[PDB]
Every structure is written in C-alpha cells, then in structure tokens.
Design a protein around this ligand. Sequence first.
Ligand SMILES: C/C(=C/C=C/[C@@H](C)C(=O)O)[C@H]1CN[C@H](C(=O)O)[C@H]1CC(=O)O
Ligand SMILES: C/C(=C/C=C/[C@@H](C)C(=O)O)[C@H]1CN[C@H](C(=O)O)[C@H]1CC(=O)O
Lengths: 304, 84, 23, 49
Amino acid sequence: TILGFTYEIRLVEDGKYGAQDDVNGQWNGMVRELIDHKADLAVAPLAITYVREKVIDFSKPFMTLGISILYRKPNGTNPGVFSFLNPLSPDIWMYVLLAYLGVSVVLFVILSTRIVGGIWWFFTLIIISSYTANLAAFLTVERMESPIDSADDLAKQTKIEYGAVEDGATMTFFKKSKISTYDKMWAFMSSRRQSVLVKSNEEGIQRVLTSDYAFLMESTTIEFVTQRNCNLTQIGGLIDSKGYGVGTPMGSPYRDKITIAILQLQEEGKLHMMKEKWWRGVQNIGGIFIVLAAGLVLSVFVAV
Amino acid sequence: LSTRIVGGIWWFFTLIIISSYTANLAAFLTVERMESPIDSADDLAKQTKIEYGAVEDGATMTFFKKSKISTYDKMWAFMSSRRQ
Amino acid sequence: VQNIGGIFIVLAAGLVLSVFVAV
Amino acid sequence: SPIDSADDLAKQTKIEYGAVEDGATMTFFKKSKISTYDKMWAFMSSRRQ
Ligand SMILES: C/C(=C/C=C/[C@@H](C)C(=O)O)[C@H]1CN[C@H](C(=O)O)[C@H]1CC(=O)O
Ligand SMILES: C/C(=C/C=C/[C@@H](C)C(=O)O)[C@H]1CN[C@H](C(=O)O)[C@H]1CC(=O)O
C-alpha cells in the first residue's frame, strides 16, 4: 500500500533459511535463492548477522530482539489441601501417640508428680528441638536450591540439557565468540552434537515439554509461546542484540526506498499495533489451623 | 479435663507456630549469611550476569586490548563482542 | 528412629524409675 | 572448611596466597594445562605488588 508494487509469494524449495555448507562454500536456503535473483524480497524473519550481511544485502531492521533461554515452569512444589504427612513422617507421629498412650495409662495411678512433669518437660523439649532442627534444615536446603536464572547457572551445570536450532547464529554465533562461558557452550554443542541440534522449532519446543530441556531461541517468539502455552517460562536476560530485516540482492535499487518506507512506518509506530494484535491473543502451615478448629469444635461438642 | 485439653491444644498451637517461625527465620538468616557479593575483578569476568564497560575508547580500553593476562582479556573480549 | 528411639528408651526407663518411686 | 589442596584455594579469595617473585615457582602457573593454575596466575597478576 505504501509503494504500489504487486507481489507474489513463492515458497522456497528446501524450506530452510540462509546457511552454507563448508564442504564447497555453496550457500543454500535464502542466500542461494537470493544471489541468483530467483526472488527479490525476503520478508522471512532472517537474522542480521555478519557473514549473511557480507554476502547479501539487508535492509534496516524493522524490529530488534536477542537470543534467550526457554525453560519449563518449575511448578513441582505445592502443599495443596492438608498434606502434612510429608513433614514429620507418621513414624514419629505414632511414636508420640504411643508416648501419649503410655503417659495416659500411667496417669491412672498418679514427689511422683514433679518427676513425671519433669520427664514430660524434657521429653517434649527434645522432641520439639529435633523437629525444629529438621524443619530448619529442610527449609534451608529448599531455599538454597534456586532455578537457573541465566546462562551462567546453565554454564555451571550439565545435567539439564540445553541447545538451539542447528546453525543460524546460535552455535555459529558461539564459534564467532571469544567469551569463555560461551566457548564452553560451543564446546558443549560440539561434544553433545548428536542429540540436541534439532533444526525444527517444534521439537525444540517439544523437548522442553517432555525432557528437562533448555532451548536457546528468539526473544520475540518467547512472547508467542508464552501467550499460547502458560506452562513455559523465559529465563535469562538478553544475550546479544540482533534484528529482523528485509533481504535484498546486492545493489538492489529498491532497498533504499524499502528502508525509507520502514522508517516511515516506524514514524507513526505502525508496527506495534499488529505486533500486539498477532502476538497477544504458606499452605504447609494452614492445616494446623483446621486441626485447631476441629479440636475446638470437638471440645465444644464434648462440653455440651 | 476439657479445660486441660483446651489449654493443651492452645500451648501446642502457639508452640507449633513459634516452631515454624524459628524454622523460617533460621532459613532466612542462613541464606542471608551465606549470600556473598562480588568484589574482585575476576568476579565480573567469570559470569555474564553482570555486564560492564569503560568510559570510552582510550587508556581504559587499550589496557584490556593489550591484556596478555587472559583474565582481563576475557572480559575485554566480552565487552568487545557487544560494543553497541 | 535412631535418636528418637533412644529418647523413647530413656523415657521408658524413666517411667520404670517413676513406677519404682511410686511404690 | 580447612584448606586441603590447591583446588580449594583456586576458588578461594579471602585468603591471599603467593610465592617467590623470581624463581622456578613462577613457571608452574606460567605454563599449565589446568585452568586452576591459570586462576592462581590471575591471583599473582592481580596481586603483583
Ligand atoms: C530456526 C531457524 C533455523 C535456521 C537454520 C539454518 C540451517 C538455516 O537454514 O539457515 C531460523 C529461524 N529464523 C532465524 C533467522 O534466520 O533469523 C533462524 C535462526 C536464527 O538465526 O536465529
Ligand atoms: C629454594 C629457592 C629459594 C629462593 C631464592 C630466591 C629468594 C633468590 O635468592 O633469588 C630457589 C631454588 N631455585 C629456585 C629459583 O629458580 O630461583 C628458587 C625457588 C623458586 O622461587 O622457585
């Protein structure tokens, strides 16, 4: 509507983006389809990398983004309704019930009262001391466990599997990266090549749903997969800033008018409205209150 | 015996809520005392959670450019990779 | 168990001693 | 915990450590195949005075 050109959409024959093979230097995907002038405009969301900018021409990026880490929501901890069997296991509960039965059967025949009260005192103090120590240890081992906040915590671990789509920046960005943690990421990608280098974004989503997987993927599509699926989460900030631009052949005379039109659309903020249109659209303690209420209503029922 | 068991469950209730309070405070104090901040120059070059940079190009940046230590050189490469 | 069973054993021995006191 | 070997002081930083200025003790962390000895070299370079 802003330039008056008529256009026809044709699917590329291999269904993949612009990459190259190192065995011959031949590009394939978007770049090979664009150097031979088979198509002119590449509106498909390509990344503005370095070597793909060097080979073929890009417009100005109409929006920016980065790579980030997709993870399963760690919602495995929930007390729920009652469920106080898990803290202070019922072996201890039947032990103290047998102790209460023993003091109840001694209570019929009862200088004796002072020592019975004393042994009851330090028995209850030792029991409550052990329970407070165990609960404090349990809370400080639960609180010292944290989710993987960013890429450094994922670099510290190796048990949770991680990876990205095969080629297309990601690990080819990591081999063009001298950061030692990201060098360890690239060494992991080389060492664990044969399991997690899935090209499809569907199975890269699907491996997070089934397995304990982290998936390195585009920060824009985080919004789409979190609007669709509410069981997923984003961890980490933004690694490095990239963008989505328009792919043109080298020396295309239309490209200057295309980026002037992109800046004209961004002058009024035209992109944001259809971006939002297409892209948006203590209980562990609570049981003892019920226990005290049941005991109070039992005392009320036996009092009358 | 009814007043005795009401007093017993009252002492038990305040006992268990102070027990949970002590466990919560002990966990909070243990996490706070085991938490340590960053002070060394290697404590920023080790992870990517903290980003950093110099004022501009010049004596700050050319010292890390000439870093043969491979400790300032690693953070130099990190800040060089995302100079924008 | 372990510590708790030993505390139970000590409690039973003290109960036996209190019965011996009560005679 | 008390100190047990060089890997425990490799991650440690509150206890400073060093060696002779010029000698053969330098060349263990000048050339090494373990990154912990590189961390001790970083410890020497940060505390060269
Ligand atoms: C998921 C993906 C895979 C690319 C794979 C390689 C082998 C390719 O065909 O260039 C694409 C999606 N669009 C991205 C882009 O080009 O911006 C690219 C991945 C990426 O570069 O972040
Ligand atoms: C035992 C020893 C002691 C230190 C000597 C220094 C203080 C000196 O007089 O230069 C020597 C042995 N040869 C080493 C050297 O090559 O200087 C040095 C030990 C070392 O510092 O590695």
